[PDB]
Amino acid sequence: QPEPDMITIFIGTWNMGNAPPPKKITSWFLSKGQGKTRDDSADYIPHDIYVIGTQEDPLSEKEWLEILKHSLQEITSVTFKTVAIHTLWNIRIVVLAKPEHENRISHICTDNVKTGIANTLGNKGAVGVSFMFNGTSLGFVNSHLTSGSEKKLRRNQNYMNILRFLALGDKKLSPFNITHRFTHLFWFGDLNYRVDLPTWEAETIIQKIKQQQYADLLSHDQLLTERREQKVFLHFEEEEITFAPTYRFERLTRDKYAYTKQKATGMKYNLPSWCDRVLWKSYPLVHVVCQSYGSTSDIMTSDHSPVFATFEAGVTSQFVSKNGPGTVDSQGQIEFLRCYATLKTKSQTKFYLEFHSSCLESFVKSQEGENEEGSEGELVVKFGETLPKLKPIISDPEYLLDQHILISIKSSDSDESYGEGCIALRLEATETQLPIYTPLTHHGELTGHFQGEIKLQTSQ
Ligand SMILES: CN1CCN(c2ccc(C#N)cc2)CC1
């Protein structure tokens, strides 16, 4: 039985509007409805992993697991295994996998973050799941962010609290938040960003939707515009949206958007919006292709429509050589030449680097770099040719070229990370000096850059 080098992952997000689902929800798992939909010829082919995010979910974990498993069994004739289920209030994540993957999945983690303080603490936040699939780390975040058209900044703050405080993945990666811990990170949910047009334009917006003319609406989508201005979701991707806004519908039809202010809305308008989203971030030069992104048309119990996304994702095998794991492979080495970090910090402390990777027996601390002043005010930390030679556990190029090195730049004074990034070892050549680059972030905000050259030696 050969180990896979690709899997397909289903991501679903649905705000259920505190109503039980209808008897049939198979269209969701089949990526059928509006948008980028899945070919009919694939309907019987199971995805490898299904990740279901709900919000305003009124069901018990048991009730929802029974509907999900029976749904997938009807579609695929496969009885899926439950990897994980985690619920915060009415926010839930379920991870299901094909039975053949049971002994490929390990290190399962779950966590939640509650957003807001006092007033604003009590129903919004996120749940997450991570695990290893053979040699590949996978993370999944289902978030229900702050509602309301005039709260995009709150949403962006909820995002930063969730990425700072959701504790998933390998805890040995202590300098790194969830945006660096996984080969593939999927973030989805009722993110609650709105189409930011005047209230008086509600019927115009509805007209545009009925004509399937989304361009003038998406140019005012707060998630796209906030992302464009680097206010939120920096270094994440989203597929092009080609489906109608998924909120706010009259229940039991999809023929009507209910946008007018009501006591039940706190006298807020809910102009038609793409509240329900799927985004991802994968390490550099790993295969990840979105194969569907859309909304269902036939599930109408909620004032939101379910959203689906599917992905091809590269995975690697759990590699064993004669040498590592449990020792170094002297035929392998990673060298760094002419490296420097450019930091936005106004501070003057010394800095050192930490290199973290599952290709190393443990993380490596560098010597302190030399601080200089950039021509436009910046701090430049020069490492020159001073960085340590990294000793991988396995030298086989079939393993080593698939790996990644996480970098943190840390203050000598405080041992606090000022910036985190990631370098792919998927190089154009071995035994050859080649440029490398990563942006550096801290709490998911840009703090600098790391650049230089790498020289990778494999056994070939
Ligand atoms: C690195 N890429 C991902 C983020 N980018 C964008 C572009 C347009 C909008 C809009 N509207 C939002 C984000 C640039 C390309």
Side-chain angles (χ1 to χ4, degrees), residues 2-460:
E3 293 307 312
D5 79 334
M6 213 77 100
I7 59 170
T8 69
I9 301 172
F10 176 97
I11 307 297
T13 183
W14 186 28
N15 178 321
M16 292 175 77
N18 309 107
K23 65 182 164 285
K24 183 169 179 79
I25 58 166
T26 54
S27 59
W28 191 22
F29 306 125
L30 289 174
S31 295
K32 302 300 174 66
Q34 286 181 336
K36 182 186 195 73
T37 63
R38 187 166 183 238
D39 199 81
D40 296 332
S41 67
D43 287 355
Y44 303 156
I45 297 171
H47 296 292
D48 293 286
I49 304 177
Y50 294 73
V51 186
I52 307 84
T54 53
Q55 313 83 32
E56 299 189 42
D57 183 333
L59 299 180
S60 64
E61 285 183 352
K62 170 171 180 177
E63 286 169 330
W64 188 220
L65 280 171
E66 193 188 310
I67 289 158
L68 292 174
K69 285 202 175 189
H70 287 148
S71 288
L72 296 181
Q73 179 138 93
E74 181 168 73
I75 291 161
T76 66
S77 301
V78 170
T79 301
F80 278 79
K81 296 292 191 173
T82 307
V83 171
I85 182 163
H86 190 70
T87 308
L88 168 65
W89 296 316
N90 298 101
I91 311 160
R92 178 176 291 150
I93 185 168
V94 183
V95 179
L96 305 175
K98 297 180 57 197
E100 68 198 65
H101 296 327
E102 186 178 345
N103 301 286
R104 300 180 166 120
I105 291 168
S106 71
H107 297 83
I108 301 158
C109 302
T110 62
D111 199 23
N112 64 264
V113 167
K114 296 169 177 180
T115 54
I117 46 159
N119 268 258
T120 70
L121 195 154
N123 87 291
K124 297 306 192 293
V127 293
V129 176
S130 67
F131 53 94
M132 296 288 299
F133 185 97
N134 284 335
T136 299
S137 59
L138 299 175
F140 305 93
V141 179
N142 172 26
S143 64
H144 190 179
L145 305 184
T146 297
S147 66
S149 66
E150 311 309 301
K151 300 191 169 172
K152 80 184 179 187
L153 172 64
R154 282 296 174 264
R155 288 184 276 280
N156 298 347
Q157 294 166 345
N158 295 159
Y159 163 83
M160 177 183 290
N161 288 313
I162 293 159
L163 73 86
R164 282 180 71 180
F165 299 124
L166 200 64
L168 299 171
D170 175 5
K171 303 315 182 274
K172 297 195 153 160
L173 294 180
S174 55
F176 303 101
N177 64 59
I178 51 162
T179 75
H180 284 116
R181 285 186 177 191
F182 305 106
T183 315
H184 302 282
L185 170 62
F186 297 92
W187 191 323
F188 49 97
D190 181 358
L191 311 188
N192 250 320
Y193 291 91
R194 307 308 180 91
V195 168
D196 207 345
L197 280 170
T199 309
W200 55 261
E201 291 286 43
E203 291 297 330
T204 303
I205 292 161
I206 290 164
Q207 302 206 307
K208 293 295 189 184
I209 301 168
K210 291 171 162 179
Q211 297 170 90
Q212 302 176 60
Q213 287 175 19
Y214 305 134
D216 294 347
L217 302 183
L218 286 165
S219 71
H220 297 269
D221 174 70
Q222 293 166 336
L223 182 50
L224 283 170
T225 63
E226 291 295 270
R227 277 181 64 221
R228 189 167 59 206
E229 289 179 39
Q230 290 183 36
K231 302 301 194 79
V232 77
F233 278 104
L234 181 61
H235 302 145
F236 282 72
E237 305 302 328
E238 190 185 28
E239 179 59 282
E240 183 180 0
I241 292 166
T242 65
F243 50 100
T246 55
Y247 183 70
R248 174 176 181 248
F249 289 102
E250 187 185 296
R251 291 181 200 241
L252 300 190
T253 181
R254 294 293 82 157
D255 288 346
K256 186 189 275 157
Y257 285 100
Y259 66 81
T260 206
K261 71 182 184 177
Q262 288 281 266
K263 290 190 258 177
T265 69
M267 302 305 298
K268 290 174 202 316
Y269 288 95
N270 288 295
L271 298 183
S273 291
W274 286 281
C275 286
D276 308 298
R277 304 295 271 269
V278 176
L279 300 89
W280 71 95
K281 180 183 183 182
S282 302
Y283 284 170
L285 297 179
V286 182
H287 182 86
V288 53
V289 178
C290 180
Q291 292 283 36
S292 72
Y293 190 37
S295 64
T296 63
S297 312
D298 58 345
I299 300 169
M300 300 169 296
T301 51
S302 179
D303 49 4
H304 296 245
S305 286
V307 166
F308 48 81
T310 64
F311 301 85
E312 301 181 339
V315 293
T316 64
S317 297
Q318 300 182 43
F319 214 94
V320 179
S321 77
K322 293 190 174 182
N323 299 303
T327 194
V328 292
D329 190 335
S330 63
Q331 294 155 97
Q333 50 175 77
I334 312 171
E335 302 180 283
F336 293 94
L337 289 88
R338 305 177 55 175
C339 289
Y340 58 94
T342 304
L343 303 182
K344 299 187 183 292
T345 190
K346 288 166 206 181
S347 112
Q348 266 288 3
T349 168
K350 294 196 182 164
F351 292 94
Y352 64 93
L353 298 187
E354 291 183 0
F355 303 90
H356 291 65
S357 179
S358 33
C359 77
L360 308 172
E361 285 212 290
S362 64
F363 81 83
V364 175
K365 280 153 134 57
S366 86
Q367 297 204 297
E368 288 174 323
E370 288 190 342
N371 294 355
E372 324 173 20
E373 181 101 40
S375 71
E376 273 182 293
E378 324 90 283
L379 175 62
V380 171
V381 182
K382 182 165 152 188
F383 292 98
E385 317 299 305
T386 61
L387 297 174
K389 176 183 324 191
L390 305 180
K391 297 318 192 72
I393 56 161
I394 293 163
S395 59
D396 182 343
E398 292 252 50
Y399 168 81
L400 195 49
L401 293 164
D402 282 348
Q403 304 306 308
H404 292 84
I405 310 303
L406 294 173
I407 297 184
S408 168
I409 183 155
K410 288 174 131 184
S411 159
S412 301
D413 292 350
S414 71
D415 292 305
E416 60 189 325
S417 182
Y418 279 55
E420 300 99 52
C422 181
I423 301 296
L425 299 190
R426 191 166 275 175
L427 312 187
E428 289 297 349
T430 62
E431 297 180 312
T432 305
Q433 284 166 38
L434 292 168
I436 58 172
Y437 168 75
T438 182
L440 295 176
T441 63
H442 190 68
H443 303 163
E445 282 181 345
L446 192 66
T447 57
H449 305 280
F450 179 85
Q451 62 208 282
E453 294 170 325
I454 199 161
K455 208 175 112 202
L456 179 65
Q457 189 158 146
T458 73
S459 59
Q460 281 308 124

Short mmCIF file of all heavy atoms in Angstrom, two decimals, residues 275-319:
data_model
loop_
_atom_site.label_atom_id
_atom_site.label_comp_id
_atom_site.label_asym_id
_atom_site.label_seq_id
_atom_site.Cartn_x
_atom_site.Cartn_y
_atom_site.Cartn_z
N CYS A 275 -20.35 36.65 4.24
CA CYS A 275 -19.89 36.50 5.65
C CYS A 275 -19.07 35.23 5.82
O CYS A 275 -18.25 35.15 6.75
CB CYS A 275 -21.08 36.39 6.58
SG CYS A 275 -21.87 38.02 6.76
N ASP A 276 -19.29 34.24 4.97
CA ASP A 276 -18.89 32.84 5.20
C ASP A 276 -17.79 32.45 4.24
O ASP A 276 -18.01 32.47 3.02
CB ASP A 276 -20.14 32.01 5.07
CG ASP A 276 -21.23 32.57 5.97
OD1 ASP A 276 -21.00 32.58 7.19
OD2 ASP A 276 -22.27 33.06 5.42
N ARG A 277 -16.59 32.23 4.75
CA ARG A 277 -15.38 32.26 3.90
C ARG A 277 -14.45 31.10 4.23
O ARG A 277 -14.45 30.59 5.37
CB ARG A 277 -14.66 33.60 4.15
CG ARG A 277 -15.50 34.84 3.91
CD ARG A 277 -15.96 35.06 2.49
NE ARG A 277 -14.94 35.83 1.78
CZ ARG A 277 -14.89 37.16 1.67
NH1 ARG A 277 -15.81 37.92 2.24
NH2 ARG A 277 -13.92 37.73 0.96
N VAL A 278 -13.59 30.76 3.27
CA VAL A 278 -12.50 29.80 3.48
C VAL A 278 -11.22 30.40 2.92
O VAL A 278 -11.19 30.81 1.76
CB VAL A 278 -12.79 28.44 2.82
CG1 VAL A 278 -11.58 27.54 3.00
CG2 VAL A 278 -14.08 27.79 3.28
N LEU A 279 -10.21 30.50 3.76
CA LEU A 279 -8.87 30.97 3.39
C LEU A 279 -7.83 29.93 3.79
O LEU A 279 -8.11 29.04 4.59
CB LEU A 279 -8.50 32.31 4.02
CG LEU A 279 -9.45 33.44 3.62
CD1 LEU A 279 -10.64 33.54 4.58
CD2 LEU A 279 -8.75 34.76 3.60
N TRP A 280 -6.65 30.01 3.19
CA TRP A 280 -5.59 29.06 3.58
C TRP A 280 -4.23 29.73 3.50
O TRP A 280 -4.02 30.73 2.81
CB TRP A 280 -5.60 27.80 2.70
CG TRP A 280 -5.14 28.00 1.28
CD1 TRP A 280 -3.89 27.79 0.80
CD2 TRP A 280 -5.92 28.46 0.16
NE1 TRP A 280 -3.84 28.09 -0.53
CE2 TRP A 280 -5.07 28.48 -0.97
CE3 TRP A 280 -7.25 28.86 0.01
CZ2 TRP A 280 -5.52 28.86 -2.25
CZ3 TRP A 280 -7.69 29.25 -1.23
CH2 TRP A 280 -6.84 29.25 -2.34
N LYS A 281 -3.28 29.09 4.15
CA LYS A 281 -1.88 29.47 4.05
C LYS A 281 -1.06 28.21 4.13
O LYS A 281 -1.17 27.46 5.11
CB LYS A 281 -1.51 30.38 5.21
CG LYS A 281 -0.06 30.84 5.21
CD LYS A 281 0.33 31.67 6.39
CE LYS A 281 1.76 32.15 6.29
NZ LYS A 281 2.10 32.91 7.51
N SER A 282 -0.24 27.98 3.12
CA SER A 282 0.62 26.79 3.08
C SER A 282 2.05 27.27 3.04
O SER A 282 2.32 28.34 2.56
CB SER A 282 0.26 25.91 1.93
OG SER A 282 -1.09 25.50 1.98
N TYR A 283 2.95 26.45 3.50
CA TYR A 283 4.39 26.77 3.42
C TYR A 283 4.79 26.94 1.95
O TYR A 283 4.16 26.42 1.01
CB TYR A 283 5.22 25.63 4.00
CG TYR A 283 5.26 25.49 5.50
CD1 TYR A 283 5.82 24.36 6.07
CD2 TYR A 283 4.80 26.47 6.38
CE1 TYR A 283 5.93 24.21 7.44
CE2 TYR A 283 4.93 26.34 7.75
CZ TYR A 283 5.49 25.19 8.29
OH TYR A 283 5.58 24.97 9.63
N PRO A 284 5.84 27.73 1.73
CA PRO A 284 6.26 28.04 0.37
C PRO A 284 6.60 26.78 -0.43
O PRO A 284 7.20 25.83 0.12
CB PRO A 284 7.49 28.93 0.50
CG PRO A 284 7.73 29.14 1.98
CD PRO A 284 6.58 28.50 2.74
N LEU A 285 6.15 26.76 -1.68
CA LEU A 285 6.47 25.70 -2.68
C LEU A 285 5.93 24.33 -2.26
O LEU A 285 6.56 23.29 -2.58
CB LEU A 285 7.98 25.65 -2.94
CG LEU A 285 8.54 26.93 -3.55
CD1 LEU A 285 10.05 26.83 -3.76
CD2 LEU A 285 7.85 27.27 -4.87
N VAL A 286 4.82 24.31 -1.52
CA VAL A 286 4.05 23.07 -1.30
C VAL A 286 2.82 23.14 -2.20
O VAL A 286 2.20 24.23 -2.32
CB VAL A 286 3.66 22.91 0.18
CG1 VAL A 286 2.91 21.61 0.41
CG2 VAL A 286 4.89 23.00 1.07
N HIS A 287 2.49 22.02 -2.80
CA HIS A 287 1.32 21.93 -3.69
C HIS A 287 0.06 22.18 -2.86
O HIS A 287 -0.18 21.45 -1.89
CB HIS A 287 1.31 20.58 -4.35
CG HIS A 287 0.20 20.40 -5.29
ND1 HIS A 287 0.28 20.81 -6.61
CD2 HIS A 287 -1.01 19.82 -5.15
CE1 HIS A 287 -0.86 20.49 -7.22
NE2 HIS A 287 -1.66 19.87 -6.35
N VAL A 288 -0.74 23.16 -3.28
CA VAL A 288 -2.09 23.36 -2.71
C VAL A 288 -2.91 23.98 -3.83
O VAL A 288 -2.50 25.02 -4.33
CB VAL A 288 -2.11 24.15 -1.39
CG1 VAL A 288 -1.38 25.49 -1.49
CG2 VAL A 288 -3.54 24.31 -0.90
N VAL A 289 -3.96 23.32 -4.26
CA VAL A 289 -4.83 23.84 -5.35
C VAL A 289 -6.28 23.79 -4.88
O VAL A 289 -6.74 22.74 -4.47
CB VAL A 289 -4.68 23.01 -6.64
CG1 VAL A 289 -5.62 23.56 -7.70
CG2 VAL A 289 -3.25 22.99 -7.15
N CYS A 290 -6.96 24.92 -4.94
CA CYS A 290 -8.41 24.99 -4.65
C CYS A 290 -9.15 24.41 -5.85
O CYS A 290 -8.99 24.94 -6.99
CB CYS A 290 -8.83 26.42 -4.41
SG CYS A 290 -10.60 26.50 -4.04
N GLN A 291 -9.95 23.37 -5.63
CA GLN A 291 -10.69 22.67 -6.71
C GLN A 291 -12.19 22.98 -6.63
O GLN A 291 -12.92 22.53 -7.52
CB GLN A 291 -10.44 21.16 -6.66
CG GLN A 291 -9.01 20.74 -7.01
CD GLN A 291 -8.72 20.78 -8.49
OE1 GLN A 291 -9.21 21.65 -9.21
NE2 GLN A 291 -7.88 19.86 -8.93
N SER A 292 -12.65 23.65 -5.58
CA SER A 292 -14.04 24.14 -5.51
C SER A 292 -14.13 25.21 -4.44
O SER A 292 -13.34 25.19 -3.51
CB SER A 292 -15.07 23.09 -5.28
OG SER A 292 -15.10 22.53 -3.97
N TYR A 293 -15.02 26.15 -4.65
CA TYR A 293 -15.33 27.22 -3.69
C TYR A 293 -16.68 27.78 -4.10
O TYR A 293 -16.82 28.46 -5.11
CB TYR A 293 -14.27 28.33 -3.67
CG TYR A 293 -14.40 29.34 -2.56
CD1 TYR A 293 -14.81 28.94 -1.28
CD2 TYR A 293 -14.01 30.66 -2.73
CE1 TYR A 293 -14.82 29.84 -0.23
CE2 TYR A 293 -13.98 31.55 -1.66
CZ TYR A 293 -14.44 31.14 -0.42
OH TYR A 293 -14.38 31.96 0.66
N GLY A 294 -17.67 27.51 -3.29
CA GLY A 294 -19.03 27.91 -3.63
C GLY A 294 -19.99 27.80 -2.49
O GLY A 294 -19.59 27.49 -1.33
N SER A 295 -21.25 28.00 -2.79
CA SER A 295 -22.32 27.89 -1.78
C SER A 295 -23.43 26.98 -2.28
O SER A 295 -23.62 26.85 -3.51
CB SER A 295 -22.85 29.23 -1.45
OG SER A 295 -23.47 29.81 -2.60
N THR A 296 -24.09 26.31 -1.35
CA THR A 296 -25.26 25.47 -1.72
C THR A 296 -26.46 26.39 -2.00
O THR A 296 -26.49 27.55 -1.51
CB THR A 296 -25.57 24.37 -0.69
OG1 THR A 296 -25.89 25.06 0.53
CG2 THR A 296 -24.43 23.40 -0.50
N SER A 297 -27.37 25.88 -2.82
CA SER A 297 -28.64 26.56 -3.18
C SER A 297 -29.87 25.86 -2.59
O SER A 297 -30.98 26.49 -2.64
CB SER A 297 -28.76 26.66 -4.67
OG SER A 297 -27.57 27.16 -5.29
N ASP A 298 -29.74 24.67 -2.02
CA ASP A 298 -30.89 23.83 -1.66
C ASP A 298 -30.95 23.59 -0.16
O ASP A 298 -31.76 22.77 0.24
CB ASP A 298 -30.86 22.52 -2.44
CG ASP A 298 -29.60 21.70 -2.24
OD1 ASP A 298 -28.62 22.26 -1.72
OD2 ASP A 298 -29.57 20.55 -2.74
N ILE A 299 -30.15 24.30 0.67
CA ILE A 299 -30.17 24.12 2.15
C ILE A 299 -30.59 25.48 2.73
O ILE A 299 -29.82 26.43 2.68
CB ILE A 299 -28.82 23.62 2.68
CG1 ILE A 299 -28.45 22.26 2.08
CG2 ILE A 299 -28.84 23.64 4.21
CD1 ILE A 299 -27.01 21.86 2.36
N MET A 300 -31.82 25.57 3.25
CA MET A 300 -32.47 26.88 3.48
C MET A 300 -33.05 27.00 4.90
O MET A 300 -33.91 27.84 5.10
CB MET A 300 -33.57 27.07 2.42
CG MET A 300 -32.99 27.05 1.00
SD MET A 300 -34.22 26.97 -0.33
CE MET A 300 -34.93 25.36 0.01
N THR A 301 -32.54 26.22 5.86
CA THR A 301 -33.01 26.30 7.26
C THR A 301 -32.45 27.52 7.95
O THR A 301 -33.01 27.93 8.97
CB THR A 301 -32.70 24.99 7.96
OG1 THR A 301 -31.30 24.72 7.71
CG2 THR A 301 -33.55 23.87 7.41
N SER A 302 -31.32 28.03 7.49
CA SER A 302 -30.61 29.14 8.12
C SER A 302 -30.77 30.40 7.29
O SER A 302 -31.07 30.31 6.08
CB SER A 302 -29.17 28.78 8.32
OG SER A 302 -28.46 29.86 8.91
N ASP A 303 -30.43 31.53 7.87
CA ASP A 303 -30.33 32.81 7.13
C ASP A 303 -28.97 32.92 6.44
O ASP A 303 -28.71 33.93 5.79
CB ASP A 303 -30.62 33.98 8.05
CG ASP A 303 -29.89 34.01 9.36
OD1 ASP A 303 -29.03 33.14 9.62
OD2 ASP A 303 -30.21 34.92 10.14
N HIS A 304 -28.11 31.92 6.63
CA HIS A 304 -26.88 31.76 5.83
C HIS A 304 -26.99 30.53 4.97
O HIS A 304 -27.57 29.54 5.41
CB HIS A 304 -25.62 31.61 6.68
CG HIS A 304 -25.24 32.78 7.53
ND1 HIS A 304 -24.10 33.49 7.33
CD2 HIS A 304 -25.77 33.22 8.70
CE1 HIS A 304 -23.98 34.40 8.30
NE2 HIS A 304 -24.99 34.28 9.14
N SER A 305 -26.36 30.56 3.81
CA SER A 305 -26.11 29.34 3.02
C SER A 305 -24.76 28.74 3.40
O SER A 305 -23.80 29.47 3.62
CB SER A 305 -26.15 29.65 1.56
OG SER A 305 -27.52 29.86 1.16
N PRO A 306 -24.69 27.40 3.48
CA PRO A 306 -23.42 26.69 3.60
C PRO A 306 -22.48 27.09 2.46
O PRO A 306 -22.90 27.29 1.32
CB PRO A 306 -23.79 25.20 3.49
CG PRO A 306 -25.27 25.15 3.89
CD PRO A 306 -25.84 26.46 3.39
N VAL A 307 -21.19 27.13 2.80
CA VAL A 307 -20.05 27.34 1.87
C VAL A 307 -19.19 26.08 1.93
O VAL A 307 -18.91 25.56 3.02
CB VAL A 307 -19.27 28.63 2.20
CG1 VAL A 307 -17.92 28.75 1.52
CG2 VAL A 307 -20.12 29.85 1.89
N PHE A 308 -18.72 25.67 0.76
CA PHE A 308 -17.76 24.56 0.58
C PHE A 308 -16.52 25.09 -0.11
O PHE A 308 -16.55 25.98 -0.97
CB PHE A 308 -18.39 23.42 -0.23
CG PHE A 308 -19.10 23.87 -1.49
CD1 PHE A 308 -18.38 24.14 -2.64
CD2 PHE A 308 -20.46 23.99 -1.55
CE1 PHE A 308 -19.01 24.53 -3.81
CE2 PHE A 308 -21.10 24.39 -2.70
CZ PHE A 308 -20.37 24.67 -3.85
N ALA A 309 -15.41 24.50 0.25
CA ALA A 309 -14.17 24.61 -0.52
C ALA A 309 -13.48 23.25 -0.50
O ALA A 309 -13.50 22.57 0.52
CB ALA A 309 -13.27 25.66 0.06
N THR A 310 -12.85 22.90 -1.62
CA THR A 310 -12.03 21.68 -1.65
C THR A 310 -10.65 22.00 -2.18
O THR A 310 -10.45 22.96 -2.95
CB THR A 310 -12.70 20.54 -2.41
OG1 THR A 310 -12.82 20.97 -3.77
CG2 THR A 310 -14.03 20.17 -1.81
N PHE A 311 -9.72 21.21 -1.69
CA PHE A 311 -8.30 21.41 -1.99
C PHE A 311 -7.60 20.09 -2.27
O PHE A 311 -7.84 19.09 -1.62
CB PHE A 311 -7.55 22.03 -0.82
CG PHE A 311 -8.15 23.36 -0.45
CD1 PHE A 311 -9.24 23.47 0.40
CD2 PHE A 311 -7.64 24.50 -1.04
CE1 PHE A 311 -9.77 24.72 0.65
CE2 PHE A 311 -8.16 25.73 -0.78
CZ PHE A 311 -9.27 25.83 0.02
N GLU A 312 -6.75 20.12 -3.31
CA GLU A 312 -5.58 19.21 -3.43
C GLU A 312 -4.48 19.73 -2.52
O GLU A 312 -4.15 20.92 -2.59
CB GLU A 312 -5.00 19.15 -4.84
CG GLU A 312 -5.97 18.70 -5.88
CD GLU A 312 -5.39 18.63 -7.27
OE1 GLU A 312 -4.34 19.28 -7.56
OE2 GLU A 312 -5.99 17.92 -8.09
N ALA A 313 -3.93 18.86 -1.68
CA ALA A 313 -2.81 19.30 -0.82
C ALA A 313 -1.69 18.27 -0.86
O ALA A 313 -1.95 17.10 -0.62
CB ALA A 313 -3.30 19.53 0.59
N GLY A 314 -0.48 18.74 -1.14
CA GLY A 314 0.72 17.90 -1.10
C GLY A 314 0.94 17.40 0.31
O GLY A 314 0.88 18.20 1.27
N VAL A 315 1.32 16.13 0.42
CA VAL A 315 1.70 15.49 1.69
C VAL A 315 2.97 14.70 1.44
O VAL A 315 3.30 14.38 0.29
CB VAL A 315 0.59 14.59 2.26
CG1 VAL A 315 -0.60 15.46 2.68
CG2 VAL A 315 0.11 13.56 1.23
N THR A 316 3.69 14.45 2.50
CA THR A 316 4.94 13.68 2.48
C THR A 316 4.80 12.47 3.39
O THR A 316 3.97 12.45 4.31
CB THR A 316 6.15 14.55 2.84
OG1 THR A 316 6.04 15.01 4.18
CG2 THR A 316 6.31 15.70 1.88
N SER A 317 5.62 11.45 3.13
CA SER A 317 5.64 10.19 3.92
C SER A 317 6.44 10.42 5.20
O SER A 317 7.21 11.40 5.25
CB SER A 317 6.21 9.06 3.11
OG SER A 317 5.39 8.79 1.98
N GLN A 318 6.28 9.51 6.18
CA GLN A 318 7.06 9.50 7.44
C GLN A 318 8.42 8.82 7.21
O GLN A 318 8.51 7.59 7.45
CB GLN A 318 6.34 8.67 8.50
CG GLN A 318 4.93 9.15 8.87
CD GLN A 318 4.35 8.28 9.95
OE1 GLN A 318 5.02 7.92 10.93
NE2 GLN A 318 3.09 7.88 9.79
N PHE A 319 9.46 9.58 6.90
CA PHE A 319 10.74 9.09 6.35
C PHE A 319 11.61 8.43 7.41
O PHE A 319 11.78 9.06 8.48
CB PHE A 319 11.50 10.25 5.73
CG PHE A 319 12.28 9.84 4.52
CD1 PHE A 319 11.75 9.98 3.25
CD2 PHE A 319 13.54 9.29 4.66
CE1 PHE A 319 12.47 9.60 2.14
CE2 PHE A 319 14.27 8.92 3.54
CZ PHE A 319 13.73 9.07 2.28
#
